[PDB]
Amino acid sequence: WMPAYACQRPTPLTHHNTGLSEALEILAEAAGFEGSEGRLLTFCRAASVLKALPSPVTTLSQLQGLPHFGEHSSRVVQELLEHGVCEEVERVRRSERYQTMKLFTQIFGVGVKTADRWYREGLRTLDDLREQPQKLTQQQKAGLQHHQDLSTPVLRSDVDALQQVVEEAVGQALPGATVTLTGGFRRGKLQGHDVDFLITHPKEGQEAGLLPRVMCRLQDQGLILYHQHQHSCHMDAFERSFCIFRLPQPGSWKAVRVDLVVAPVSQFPFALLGWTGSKLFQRELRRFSRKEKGLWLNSHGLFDPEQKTFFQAASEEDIFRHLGLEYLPPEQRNA
Ligand SMILES: [Cl-]
Ligand code: NA
């Protein structure tokens, strides 16, 4: 028996159903490209269930009794088991609409709304974008300049090298300040497409003005190709810098997307939880909090809108406990 909420079950990094989950996730991604959030969620939930299964699915009988497996998701798995290929998935892969939306949404600073607008305006290629630079934000221009590197998977060793320079800069600016790797790499991934670091200090307030000092140090060492600093107002209400680092390599260098976020230590457990992902895990964890416990969970806190009260967490463990969930370490949140 398989819990319906992704936050109520462990989902390891590696699993037995990658071909089936990948296919369902193509249909999910395509649905989101068309603005069908409902269909996206449905396909993502089906895929996530397969990632939690402790055995490979070899016959359609194994879908029986699983949550989130309606007719459409089931037919997709059936066709892959029976024919090795799913016609609908193959049509999506070959579609100009899907290929273009994937191309554009992968660029730094481009989301679905923008990509869809560009598609409707007749843009198809990266050179089409470069030919219309009046249409681009500074982030997008930087994303296009570095797109080859930025589409190259980031390795765990790259992440290690990056974490060292960030830690050096932080340590030199403010002794006692800490840097914590979050995102998929904290969940144990060996490759990824960007790198996220969360920065805090044990004495609330000592972190004020730290981020610009860190970026100054890194910029002076030649490690920064692009930097956009943003003051506080899902991590958008924290002070943050959107960066492209120039990562040295032997006789060469590679551009790498890195976000740095500063959180006051009181909000650190919530920021860490939020930014550790996976995207589906956190979506479901927030849904659970709201639907089951009537609490609003976000990257800054856990709030009862009716009592106007906040929960003081010291750790991620505290948050799970308060919600009545068994704790899952980051490597089991790969939903
Ligand atoms: Cl994710
Ligand atoms: Na993007």
Swiss-Prot record:
Expression by tissue: Expressed in a number of tissues. Abundant in thymus.
Places the protein is found: Nucleus
Q: Does the keyword Transferase apply?
A: yes
The main place the protein resides is nucleus
Per UniProt, Mg(2+) binds at 194, 196, 259
Q: Where is this site: Responsible for the low discrimination between dNTP and rNTP?
A: 274
Taxonomically, which superkingdom? Answer: Eukaryota
Q: Which GO terms describe its cellular component?
A: nucleoplasm; nucleus
Which family, according to the similarity comment? Belongs to the DNA polymerase type-X family.
* Protein's name according to its UniProt entry: DNA-directed DNA/RNA polymerase mu
- Identify the EC number(s): 2.7.7.7
Q: Which GO terms describe its molecular function?
A: DNA binding; DNA-directed DNA polymerase activity; metal ion binding
**Catalysis: reaction(s):** DNA(n) + a 2'-deoxyribonucleoside 5'-triphosphate = DNA(n+1) + diphosphate
Part of the intact protein present: 137 to 494 of 494
Q: Name one GO biological process term.
A: somatic hypermutation of immunoglobulin genes
Provide the residue span(s) of the region labelled Involved in ssDNA binding. Answer: 187-196
In its miscellaneous comment, the UniProt entry states:
DPOLM has a reduced ability to distinguish dNTP and rNTP as substrates, and elongates them on DNA primer strand with a similar efficiency. It is able to polymerize nucleotides on RNA primer strands.
